[PDB]
Ligand binder design. Structure first.
Ligand SMILES: Nc1ncnc2c1ncn2[C@@H]1O[C@H](COP(=O)(O)OP(=O)(O)NP(=O)(O)O)[C@@H](O)[C@H]1O
Ligand SMILES: [Mg+2]
Ligand SMILES: [Zn+2]
Ligand SMILES: [Zn+2]
Lengths: 312, 470, 197, 130, 86, 97, 96, 171
């Protein structure tokens, strides 16, 4: 994924686990608990975020581009009101890509809780009192509302989004424009080679003509994106991993460690983190194509989650 | 009607008029024209026994094979950049680097298309932020004269509709149509937004797409549409608190967000130096303006070739825009990359020193601005390649503008040095480094503070710290 | 690739030919591109060293009848291409120099290579030999517009004082006007002292 | 406007050995008696000694020009390196002893030499150009 | 013009950000205002570590001398570690 | 600007500084206008023009006015212990005009 | 009907006035002396000449214009400094 | 001719080449001197090189695949509307290159089509060359679509007409 992007290995691993996301749990009486995974990339602008959303959008399938929920709507010619689908409804059992998520308005954010908790959205006007399936795995990205991102302040403080909203996401990354000379040297020379591009047959210094498309209207083992698509398709097609007890032992070990180490002082780690570990370990079992989740999967998932939340 | 013919206190009047066959598409909005036509009448649907007047056009008047030669000769002149720099706002004394940057904004960089169909900005955006009476508005109202396409607005005169585009209902058909705002009317040239700091927040939001995506996306009256806005924003603004306040950060002196500030290829922060010799020079110049000698002075400079006329420069800017689009040489490309990592290292040390992140983001987006300036500088002389000298001047202008916009325990070490080094004697820097570090970057701030005061003077290639003052 | 510098050089050639062709006058030709020519000659030396290296290693003879033959062919064709590009550039600037010799010197110097400076000296010496031996009854370097009129009016555009001609004088007073035989003043029209026709 | 008609040409710490007096003497603003003789005692000064001191001052200023540090013309930092073409703040380099001032110093030296008839100092001034 | 070069020189300003890579320099041998030994180029300057170097023996080496320098650039201290000098 | 009830097109209507073109405009209690009104003065007061861009209309009007303004200092009356910038709420740009 | 001209005005008088006003206006709370205030002197001198129906601006018009502007600046001050400023600028005004 | 600059540039254009052998050392054509070019390597080579490697090798070292500028798409666009076609965008030297290709492989269809193309465009070229001011935007939009070959013919022709009009009406 995204081979042009310097660093960001853990981000790409987390993206792959979301693309291979966790399994749904309908308990007795049909009591529903959500298997899908949700991610948010906070950070500076000019970082990898938006480009990663392009690479995710072009890698995933049933993927919706945004830059929500569901609504009852009307337009100029309609003498009537119609129920409309937002991106999560359109991405039911698919994915949503939300760039500039810090910009979303209040009536949207108030209803995002239903997507995040219940994987559904409820309608409550014009007598259409109903609830819709919106069972997607979301990846979002956001920018500071003022200035460059202050890495000392929380996401709740650098961005207007509430902590009671930001906490819904399984993984919450903060990325920043590190001023590293090796990175800067690399991306600089790539941008310079881009701006030195001369189209075919143009003389040196010749201006590019807008006439083109109508005038010509005469009619390191990294894989290909189609192969990666075919792999994720095969995993979804061929396995639904079962959850083994040794995995559980690693999971409860790591959760209760995270919830009593100094990591508590950084975040009030809670039950959502526990079920997130189960989802991520299940997703790693889907990476393996393995018929079960096992202790090996939990060991990978806890390392990634500890890095994502605490940076270590 | 022509604005300088409107009667005093009148609202400017206008006529609807028609043309057909080979007179269609012969003019664009904003062009000044002479029309020959039949003044005539028609009985519109909308008084009594009244009729709507209109003109049936019979003629319109609004490169030549010798101005081709003139602009070749002017390209061949070695002093061209100084000549154009003098020719921008010639009555305005000083502001040399700002005038140089205005020439770059007028010429623009080179617009590009990639194999993917992706397209890259050629337009430069410049923000002049600074003190009152620094001739900012005068510079914008000059640029609206010389630029072949231009629009002038003021921030408080704006609305989002009158900026991007608006719905209209045509009185002739009596049916809807969409009509362009200031950004669309500036497409292919400069929009001069004067007193930009007074603009409402929703208007400044509406600027974003037209300024960076260079489009306006529309869904109004059921008309879904997207318009093109290839535009240079030349914005002028005062600081918050009126005069620029040196004790405050630029992020405090400026209301604009870091997002919108990033979209300006160059920011100049302009201040009164209050220097007596400068003010005397300005005063002699201003009185020469008012006494009327300036007319003869500019005519002399134009006969001398030290300046060129407005129309000649307008034709020349159009000639450069239509005939040339330079590329960076490989040497220039490497030098630009190295300069990028250099200024990035400089911002890193400044942000560590200030322990605060700058209001100005020196991201990869600003390298695109330096590339764009390099291309414009080569575009003046119609050189098909932008050579290393053009990168030198482009780097000089960026250092003169946006770097100055961005680049804005010791108590113990400074007085230890005051005690240990007496007046009139010299300390070699390397020994001071060893002496203080062995007790540590507070050293060079102590040097900077004691250098700003008269007390210490770096001397002999900076190797000798000389206690020159008190 | 070895031919690219040749393309850049002959693009320079095409542009200077257009620079000369588009204007009505003889435009003084631009600077000799010693830098690109040095790059190409260095490339030729690289190719010569490659042929020497290969022809030495042909005594080891790796599939030489096809492989060494093919390698030798490609590195030889690169040298043929670069010779063509260099000679095209030099032949164009030579043609312009010859044209200028006939148009002026038979009656900007920094931009020439020193070989071109001494070439131009020799070609001017040759022209002046042709209009000095036999055929000297005709100034072979004279105008090629046919003589339209025997007498013309000419306005003095720059002052040159009293000068003689074969049976008289002109006093070239600034902004005086003569009516005179064209064959007695053509030399001064070409030298830019006289204005009309 | 009043500008002082006298350009000072001071020779610092000149010594009268006859009374060990250490005086700065100004060849333009001083009266001629105060140049050619002391002003605590009144013994006369040797002419060749005096011309030698003016030549020492002249060559001191030529050297001080040639060894000067360059300074940035807008941020006033010293040029700390050997091969930059301009300061990193975009400003051009300028001398800390601008050339105009040194031409002025040489001009007062030629005037003083012509007036007092200082043959040796005049030969030195001549041998600079020629 | 010398046959040994036409590896070849990189101007010092090309080094910046090209971490842990071999380079051949040509430089004016400064001693910086901070006191460290240094090379300067029309394009810039870089501090040098000579602690591991092998100089060529038929020469003096003084400040201000133009010296060829081969070594590995290191971004971590922004030093250039000289293999050999001539 | 207003949408003309006859034509249904948008038209400008001049404000005080258009009506007082080539005249003088008199602004009493300048200190107690809203700053979102005061900021409109800047262009006409110095550049002698008003540059509207609204409802499709985009134009520059002439506004050749001398403005004479009357104001009370901060709090209620003058206090000569202070300099001007603390006597009055007005900022340097408008005051410089 | 009347359009005065600044024929042979005292440039250096005005320039020194602007230079000194600018220097004393360095006080960060004072009335912000600016290039448009120099133009104000010239406009005002034209207005006084206009009152005389005068084709040409005299020294007296320009002196009165300077005196008006200098008084306007000098009285825009905290009283702790007004006397010193009055004494300094008196060299320009008390010639008339 | 040898020194003919527009011929030298035409020889500098690139064509798609498929190799018929494995050859060591030629990898510099694939930007790496250290390796062979393999059989069935498909590579764009300059025409001055591709012309010779297409003939010498018995099987030659290279086979020339059909270039896109002579694809059936372009040939169809030629055969509908010669004067509307932007040959300068297709290739700035298309007539010189078509002559060279027609000679390299005897291709009667391409010769007939290129003859028709040139003739039909020659009519319109003469119309714009003959028109004179007392220049039209219609002329300008047509001249943008001319090859360097056609630009040379137009320049020479238009100069002939202009010089004749000058001589007739002026003294
Ligand atoms: N450097 C200068 N040279 C000549 N005239 C100047 C100069 N600076 C200012 N002026 C004059 O002073 C006025 C400047 O007005 P203006 O252009 O509005 O300045 P500004 O930068 O826009 N200040 P503001 O409108 O308060 O933000 C004009 O009348 C100019 O003639
Ligand atoms: Mg202004
Ligand atoms: Zn004595
Ligand atoms: Zn500096």
């Amino acid at each position: 994924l995204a081979p042009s992007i310097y660093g960001h290995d853990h981000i790409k691993k987390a993206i792959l686990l979301m693309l291979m996301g966790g399994v749904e749990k309908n308990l007795e009486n049909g009591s529903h608990l959500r298997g899908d995974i949700n991610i948010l990339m906070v950070g500076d602008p000019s970082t990898a975020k938006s480009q990663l959303l392009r690479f995710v959008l072009n890698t995933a399938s049933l993927a919706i581009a945004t830059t929500l929920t569901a609504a009852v709507t009307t337009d100029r010619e309609t003498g009537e009101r119609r129920l409309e689908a937002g991106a999560m409804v359109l991405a039911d059992r698919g994915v949503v890509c939300i760039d500039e998520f810090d910009k979303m308005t209040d009536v949207d954010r108030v209803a995002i809780h239903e997507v995040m908790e219940q994987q559904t959205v409820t309608i409550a006007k014009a007598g259409i009192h109903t609830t819709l399936n919106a069972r997607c795995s979301v990846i979002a990205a956001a920018n500071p509302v003022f200035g460059q991102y202050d890495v000392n302040r929380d996401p709740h403080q650098n961005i207007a989004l509430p902590d009671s909203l930001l906490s819904r996401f399984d993984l919450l990354f903060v990325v920043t424009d590190d001023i590293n000379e090796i990175r800067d040297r690399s991306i600089s020379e790539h941008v310079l080679r881009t701006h030195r591009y001369l189209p075919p047959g143009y003389l040196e210094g010749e201006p590019v003509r807008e006439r083109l498309n109508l005038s010509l209207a005469v009619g390191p083992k990294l894989v290909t994106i189609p192969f990666l698509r075919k792999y994720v398709q095969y995993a979804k097609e061929r396995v639904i991993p079962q959850l083994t007890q040794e995995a559980i032992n690693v999971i409860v070990k790591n959760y209760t460690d995270l919830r009593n180490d100094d990591n508590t002082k950084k975040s009030p780690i809670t039950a959502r983190t526990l079920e997130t570990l189960i989802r991520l370990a299940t997703a790693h079992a889907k990476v393996r194509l393995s018929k079960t989740v096992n202790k090996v999967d939990a060991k990978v998932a806890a390392n990634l989650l500890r890095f994502a939340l605490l940076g270590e | 009607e022509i604005p300088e013919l409107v009667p005093v206190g009148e609202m400017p009047r206008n006529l609807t008029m028609t043309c057909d066959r080979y007179l269609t598409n012969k003019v664009i909005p904003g062009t000044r024209v002479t029309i020959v036509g039949i003044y005539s009448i028609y009985n519109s649907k909308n008084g009594v026994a009244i009729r709507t007047p209109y003109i049936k056009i019979l003629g319109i008047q609004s490169f030549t094979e010798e101005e081709e030669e003139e602009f070749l000769q002017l390209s061949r002149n070695p002093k061209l950049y100084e000549i154009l720099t003098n020719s921008i706002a010639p009555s305005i004394f000083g502001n040399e680097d700002i005038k140089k940057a205005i020439v770059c904004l007028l010429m623009g960089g080179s617009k590009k298309i990639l194999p993917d169909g992706m397209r890259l900005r050629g337009d430069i955006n410049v923000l002049l932020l600074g003190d009152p009476g620094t001739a900012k508005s005068q510079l914008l109202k000059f640029v609206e004269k010389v630029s072949p396409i231009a629009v002038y607005t003021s921030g408080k005169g704006s609305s989002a509709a009158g900026l991007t585009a608006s719905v209209q209902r045509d009185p002739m058909t009596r049916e809807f149509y969409l009509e362009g705002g200031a950004m669309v009317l500036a497409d292919g040239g400069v929009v001069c937004i004067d007193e930009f700091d007074k603009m409402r927040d929703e208007d400044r939001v509406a600027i974003h797409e037209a300024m960076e995506q260079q489009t306006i996306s529309i869904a109004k009256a059921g008309i879904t549409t997207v318009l093109n806005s290839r535009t240079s924003v030349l914005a002028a603004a005062n600081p918050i608190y009126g005069r620029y306040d040196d004790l405050k950060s630029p992020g405090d002196n400026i209301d604009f967000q870091t997002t919108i500030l990033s979209r300006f290829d160059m920011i100049f922060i302009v201040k009164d130096d209050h220097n007596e010799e400068r003010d005397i020079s300005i005063a002699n110049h201003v009185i020469n303006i008012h006494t009327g000698n300036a007319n003869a002075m500019q005519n002399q400079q134009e006969e001398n070739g030290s300046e060129i006329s407005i129309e000649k420069m307008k034709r020349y800017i159009t000639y450069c825009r239509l005939k040339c689009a330079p590329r960076l040489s490989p040497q220039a490309a490497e030098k630009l990359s190295s300069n990028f990592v250099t200024i990035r290292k400089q911002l890193l040390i400044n942000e560590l020193e200030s322990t605060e992140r700058s209001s100005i983001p020196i991201t990869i987006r600003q390298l695109e601005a330096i590339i764009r300036i390099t291309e414009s500088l080569a575009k003046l002389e119609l050189s098909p390649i932008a050579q290393e000298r053009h990168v030198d001047e482009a780097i000089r202008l960026f250092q003169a503008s946006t770097m100055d916009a961005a680049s804005q325990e010791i108590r113990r070490f400074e007085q230890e040095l005051k005690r240990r080094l007496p007046i009139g004697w010299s300390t070699s820097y390397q020994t001071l480094r060893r002496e203080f570090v062995d007790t540590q970057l507070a050293l060079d701030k102590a040097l900077y503070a004691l250098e700003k005061h008269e007390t210490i003077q770096l001397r002999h290639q900076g190797q000798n710290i000389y206690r020159s003052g008190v | 690739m070895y031919g690219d510098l040749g393309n850049k050089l002959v693009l320079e050639a095409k542009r200077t030919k257009q620079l000369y062709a588009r204007s009505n006058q003889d435009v003084n030709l631009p600077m000799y591109h010693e830098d690109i020519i040095r790059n190409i000659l260095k490339e030729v030396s690289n190719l010569r060293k490659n042929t020497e290296y290969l022809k030495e290693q042909q005594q080891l003879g790796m599939l030489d009848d096809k492989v060494a033959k093919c390698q030798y062919f490609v590195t030889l064709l690169c040298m043929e291409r670069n010779k063509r590009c260099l000679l095209a550039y030099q032949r164009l600037r030579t043609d312009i120099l010859d044209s200028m010799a006939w148009n002026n010197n038979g009656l900007d110097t920094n931009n020439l290579s020193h070989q071109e400076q001494e070439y131009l000296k020799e070609y001017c010496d040759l022209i002046t030999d042709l209009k000095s031996g036999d055929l000297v009854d005709i100034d072979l370097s004279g105008s090629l517009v046919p003589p339209s009129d025997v007498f013309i009016d000419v306005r003095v555009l720059k002052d040159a004082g009293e000068i003689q001609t074969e049976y008289g004088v002109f006093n070239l007073i600034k902004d005086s006007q003569f009516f005179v035989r064209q064959s007695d003043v053509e030399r001064l029209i070409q030298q830019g002292y006289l204005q009309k026709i | 406007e009043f500008k002082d008609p006298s350009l000072s040409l001071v020779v610092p710490d000149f010594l009268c050995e006859y009374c060990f007096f250490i005086s700065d003497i100004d060849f333009c603003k001083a009266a001629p008696e105060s140049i050619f003789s002391c002003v605590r005692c009144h013994k006369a000064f040797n002419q060749v000694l005096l011309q030698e001191h003016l030549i020492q001052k002249l060559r001191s200023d030529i050297e001080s020009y040639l060894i000067q540090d360059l300074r940035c013309s807008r941020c006033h930092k010293v040029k700390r390196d050997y091969m930059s073409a301009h300061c990193p703040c975009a400003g051009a380099w300028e001398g800390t002893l601008p050339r105009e001032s040194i031409v002025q110093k040489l001009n007062v030296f030629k005037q003083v030499a012509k007036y007092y008839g200082f043959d040796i100092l005049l030969s030195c001034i001549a041998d600079l150009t020629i | 013009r010398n046959e040994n070069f036409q590896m070849s020189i990189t101007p010092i300003k090309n080094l910046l950000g090209r971490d842990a890579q071999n380079f051949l320099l040509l430089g004016l041998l400064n001693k910086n205002f901070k006191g460290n030994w240094s090379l300067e180029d029309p394009s810039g300057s870089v501090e040098i570590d000579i602690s591991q170097t092998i100089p060529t023996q038929g020469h003096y080496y003084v400040p201000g001398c133009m010296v060829l320098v081969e070594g590995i650039y290191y971004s971590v201290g922004n030093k250039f570690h000289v293999t050999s000098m001539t | 600007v207003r949408k003309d009830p006859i034509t249904k097109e948008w038209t400008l209507e001049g404000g005080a500084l258009v009506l007082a073109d080539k005249g003088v405009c008199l602004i009493d209690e300048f200190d107690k206008m809203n700053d979102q009104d005061r900021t409109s003065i800047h262009e006409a007061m110095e550049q002698q023009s008003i540059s509207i861009s609204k409802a499709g209309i985009v134009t520059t009007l002439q506004a050749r006015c001398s403005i004479i303004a009357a104001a009370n200092p901060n709090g209620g009356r003058y206090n000569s212990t202070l300099p001007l910038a603390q006597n009055v709420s007005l900022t340097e740009p408008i005051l410089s005009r | 009907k009347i359009y005065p001209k600044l024929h042979q005005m005292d440039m250096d008088k005005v320039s020194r006035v602007y230079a000194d006003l600018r220097r004393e206006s360095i006080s960060t709370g004072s009335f912000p002396i600016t290039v448009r205030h120099l133009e104000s002197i010239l406009r005002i001198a034209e207005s006084f000449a206009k009152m005389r129906l005068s084709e040409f601006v005299s020294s007296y018009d320009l002196d009165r214009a300077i005196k008006v502007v200098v008084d306007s600046f000098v009285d825009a001050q905290k009283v702790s400094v007004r006397r010193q400023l009055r004494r300094s600028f008196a060299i320009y005004t008390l010639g008339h | 001719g040898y020194y003919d600059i527009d011929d030298v540039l035409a020889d500098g254009t690139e064509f798609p080449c498929k190799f018929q052998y494995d050859i060591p050392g030629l990898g510099y054509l694939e930007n790496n001197p250290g390796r062979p070019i393999t059989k069935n390597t498909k590579l764009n080579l300059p025409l001055w090189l591709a012309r010779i490697l297409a003939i010498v090798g018995p099987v030659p070292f290279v086979e020339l695949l059909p270039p896109d500028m002579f694809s059936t798409k372009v040939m169809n666009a030629i055969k509908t509307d010669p004067v509307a076609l932007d040959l300068h965008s297709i290739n700035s030297h298309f007539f010189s290159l078509a002559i060279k290709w027609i000679m390299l492989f005897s291709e009667k269809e391409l010769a007939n089509v290129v003859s028709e193309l040139l003739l039909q465009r020659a009519q319109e070229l003469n119309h714009h060359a003959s028109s004179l001011s007392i220049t039209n935007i219609a002329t300008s939009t047509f001249l943008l679509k001319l090859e360097e070959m056609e630009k040379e013919i137009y320049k020479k022709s238009h100069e002939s007409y202009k010089d004749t009009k000058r001589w007739m009406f002026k003294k």
